[PDB]
């Protein structure tokens, strides 16, 4: 109904305004922290190095910024456009995740990126639906074995369907939300909260880019970097299936 | 179809590897240059400041990089707010749309925690509204097309081709309104190039949301109504991008 959709517009609008109020309340008081830190680093350096004027340090910092802004990395193997990192970057596109922790610097890069995505995303969506159906099949089939137990326990077939859905997501959650977060905690030296934040930002395809796992491989742990890709693939499909059915439940309501 | 799933997987895999090759070819050289420039900047600073060890300068740079990475601005030493009501509103929008530009990061654990639940609840809610607007927007377009379609049928063009021509007009005008119109708008408003603007538009409507480009984010602009109003476009554009792709899928099936 057109009347109802106008209502829905207004609701969402309120969900946004309410969100805005909360983020502002939680984040505005720390808007300036990074400047402060930068200034502290400057002031500290000046005090140690009397041969340096504040102004000269300033120019150094600008020049450093320009280089970092072109993709340079502070050095003390780190190429974001070597084959593996470019592979990853392409992934971030067709998944629509779009971390963007590494920006394209060339107009050709941008141009190509347009067509790469237009063709890549739907192509990926297809594979994702495919893996979603196949993964759900495997899950629902395994859960079917546990369902056998509930039906013998004379639990109503309607609730058994519900228990299995709860199980369906709960086990996925365990495998694709919980398991990875614990993995990343140890691997990335993130906090539990940072890791879940990452995971969920990732699987929702929000892809902020403030946290990113698998862009580069780790020596002394080869299986890491692929498993992450494998994970994203499987996790996105699990997440998709949940959204389609929760989308499914919602639209009829 | 298990056979097809494996074929599809292999295809995508090749789409990625092919993408990787191209991005590396287009971007690595610029990156390798920036890395060189960073090192030139260091070497130049050492030659001018004998009180400074390379290793000490390295630490300074790492520290500067971290701060810039956290959104510090090289140019000033310290009015405008990234978390004012309008920008926070916008930020919330970037979540539920799953676009996730991320040009301003959350710094607080509360911010992150809240962001998780905000999205889990926000995205499906939005998906619903989007489907709604997609159907309603397509309806309104289809109704408007009908009157001009009357003219084609009288001109004795077959009903099968008139349907095709109308689709062309259907998308061409949508494209005009939601792709072309905005890109021309942003070109003038953001001082981007045409190519940058289309890049932005498309990165946006695909929900990739890299965050290298973000409309309204510019600090200098005195443009309060601008940034949410752009969201008005985002809403309309996303749904159209969606609804059309949905109906295309149905026609294919």
């Amino acid at each position, epitope marked *: 109904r057109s009347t109802t959709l106008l209502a829905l517009l207004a609701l969402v609008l309120l969900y946004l305004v309410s969100g805005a109020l909360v983020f502002r309340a939680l984040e505005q008081p720390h808007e300036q922290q990074a400047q402060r830190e930068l200034g502290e680093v400057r*002031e500290k350096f*000046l005090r140690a190095h*009397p*041969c*340096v004027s*504040d*102004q000269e340090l300033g120019l150094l910092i600008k020049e450093v910024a320009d280089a970092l802004g072109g993709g340079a990395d502070p050095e003390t193997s780190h190429s974001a456009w070597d084959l593996g990192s470019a592979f990853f970057f392409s992934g971030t596109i067709i998944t629509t995740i779009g971390y963007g922790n590494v920006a394209l610097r060339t107009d050709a890069g941008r141009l190509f990126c347009i067509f790469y995505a237009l063709v890549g995303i739907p192509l990926f969506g297809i594979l994702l639906a495919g893996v979603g159906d196949r993964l759900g099949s495997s899950l629902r089939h395994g859960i079917g074995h546990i369902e056998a137990i509930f039906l013998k326990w004379h639990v109503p077939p309607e609730l058994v369907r519900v228990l299995s859905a709860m199980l369906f997501l709960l086990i996925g959650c365990l495998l694709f939300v919980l398991t990875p977060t614990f993995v990343f905690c140890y691997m990335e030296d993130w906090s539990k909260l940072e890791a879940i934040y990452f995971v969920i930002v990732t699987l929702t395809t929000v892809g902020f880019g403030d946290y990113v796992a698998g862009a580069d491989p780790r020596q002394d742990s080869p299986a890491y970097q692929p498993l992450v890709w494998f994970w994203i693939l499987l996790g996105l499909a699990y997440f998709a299936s949940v959204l389609t059915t929760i989308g499914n439940w919602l639209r009829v309501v | 179809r298990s056979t097809t799933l494996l074929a599809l997987l292999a295809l995508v895999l090749l789409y990625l590897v092919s993408g990787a090759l191209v991005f590396r070819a287009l971007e690595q050289p610029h990156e390798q240059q920036a890395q060189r420039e960073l090192g030139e900047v260091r070497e130049k600073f050492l030659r*001018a*400041h004998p009180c400074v060890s390379d290793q000490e300068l390295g630490l300074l740079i790492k520290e500067v990089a971290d701060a810039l990475g956290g959104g510090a601005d090289p140019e000033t030493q310290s009015s405008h707010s990234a978390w004012d009501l309008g920008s926070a509103f916008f930020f919330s929008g970037t979540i539920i749309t799953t676009i996730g530009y991320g040009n301003v990061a959350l710094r607080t654990d509360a911010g992150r925690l809240f962001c998780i639940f905000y999205a889990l609840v926000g995205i499906p809610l939005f998906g619903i509204l989007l489907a709604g607007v997609g159907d309603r927007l397509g309806s309104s377009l289809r109704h408007g097309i009908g009157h001009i379609e009357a003219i084609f049928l009288k001109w004795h063009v077959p009903p099968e081709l008139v349907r095709v021509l109308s689709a062309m007009l259907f998308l061409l005008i949508g494209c005009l309104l939601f792709v072309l119109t905005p890109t021309f708008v942003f070109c003038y408003m953001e001082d981007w190039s045409k190519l940058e603007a289309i890049y932005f538009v498309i990165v946006t409507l695909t929900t990739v949301g890299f965050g290298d480009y973000v409309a309204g984010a510019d600090p200098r602009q005195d443009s309060p109504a601008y940034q949410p109003l752009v969201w008005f476009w985002i809403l309309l554009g996303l749904a159209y991008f969606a609804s059309v792709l949905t109906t295309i899928g149905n026609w294919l099936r």
Partner: antibody
Amino acid sequence: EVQLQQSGPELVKPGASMKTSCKVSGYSFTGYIMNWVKQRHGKNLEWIGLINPNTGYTTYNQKFKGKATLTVDKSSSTAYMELLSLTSEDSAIYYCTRGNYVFDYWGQGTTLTVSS
Amino acid sequence: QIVLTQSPAIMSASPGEKVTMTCSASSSVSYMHWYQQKSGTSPKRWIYDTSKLASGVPARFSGSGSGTSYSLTISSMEAEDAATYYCQQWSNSPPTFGAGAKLELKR
């Protein structure tokens, strides 16, 4: 005993320019930033600008951008300020002082008198 | 650009009296420095980085403050303390000075 020895008082006609000096001893000239400061009779101190004796780099107060030119002679560890197009408002005491965050040593000052 | 206000511009103290002069900044700085000047002669770094004493300085002097408000204090005035004290900042280029506070002996 660090010491910044400024040259003597100078008297010049309006319009002329004038160059004044500050010879440092007791430390290494090129290791520290040199500044100059203006004090018009018994009033606020005004930073004119700085030079880095080692690199030649200079920056100036906007107020003094056109007015003052800082230079150094490394061999004689001496710093120079030139003032240009002098007007009556330039009559003051001028100091060389050392520092990149606080001004830890000052010359004894030199008095400039601009008058017809 | 950053403006430093010292007020009042004049004050007076008997010997033994405690003396406090303040420096308020148009916007925040991380550190404040102070100079002592006696007529006839150049300023002397007196206190730097807010609360560090320069070499010569006797203990009766102290400094404190943060953000936008800083102070210089004499626990117990002495005769040789009569002078003009200036604050200055360099957390933002260009460095700037207060307009000074003149401290005379009471009688």
